[PDB]
Amino acid sequence: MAVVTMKQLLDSGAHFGHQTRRWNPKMKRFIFTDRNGIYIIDLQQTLTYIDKAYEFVKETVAHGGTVLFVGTKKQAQESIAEEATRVGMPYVNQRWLGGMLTNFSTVHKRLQRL
RNA sequence: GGCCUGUGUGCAGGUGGUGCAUGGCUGUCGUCAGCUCGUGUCGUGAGAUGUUGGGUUAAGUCCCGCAACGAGCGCAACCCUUGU
Ligand SMILES: [Mg+2]
Ligand SMILES: [Mg+2]
Ligand SMILES: [Mg+2]
Ligand SMILES: [Mg+2]
Ligand SMILES: [Mg+2]
Ligand SMILES: [Mg+2]
Ligand SMILES: [Mg+2]
Ligand SMILES: [Mg+2]
Ligand SMILES: [Mg+2]
C-alpha cells in the first residue's frame, strides 16, 4: 500500500546519492548501480520499507504513540516546520540541545519558567 | 537574714607556661576575578564536558556553533558623600 508513485518519485529525484568518497560499504546491498560517480538507490526496496514504516506508524498512532520530527539541514527546516505546525505535532528544526531525552526533568524547569 | 572580725574546710588567687590544641579578632596574595554545585554524557580508573574557539568589555559582562541543560559564591545595582 502506497500513495506516492514511482514515476513522480523519479521526477522528485530521491534516488540520487553522494559521491564515491562518502558511500558506506554497509549500503552496498541497497546500492544498485553507479553512473557518472553518483549512486542509484533501489526503488523497490525503498517502496517496501516505506510500506513497512507505513503500517508501523499506523499501529503506533492507533495505540497512541508520539513521534518527534528532527531535522537541521537548511533545505528542509521550513518544510518540516510548516508540516509539523499544520499537523499539530511537536517538532525540532533549528538546534538539537545535548541530552534532551535523557534529561527531561531539568528542562521541565525551563518549560515551566517559559 | 545582711556584714565580717579570729580557726580552718573546700577554694580564691597567677600579665607562670603552652597561638605546633584552641574560640573570637586581625594582616598579606588582592579589591586580583576567579572559584563551585544538580542532572546528563563519555572512559573501567584516577577522571573529562559544562569553564573549548572567534569577537567585545575594567570584570566567568555579553553574542555566535559546539553533549551539554541549569544554578551558586563573585562582578554591577540597591547604602554615604560630592555635581545641578
Ligand atoms: Mg607565657
Ligand atoms: Mg608565639
Ligand atoms: Mg593567585
Ligand atoms: Mg561507565
Ligand atoms: Mg578539560
Ligand atoms: Mg576541567
Ligand atoms: Mg559551557
Ligand atoms: Mg577555572
Ligand atoms: Mg561570576
Swiss-Prot record:
Belongs to the universal ribosomal protein uS2 family. This is Small ribosomal subunit protein uS2. It comes from Mycolicibacterium smegmatis (strain ATCC 700084 / mc(2)155) (Mycobacterium smegmatis). The chain holds residues 1 to 114 of 277 of the full protein.
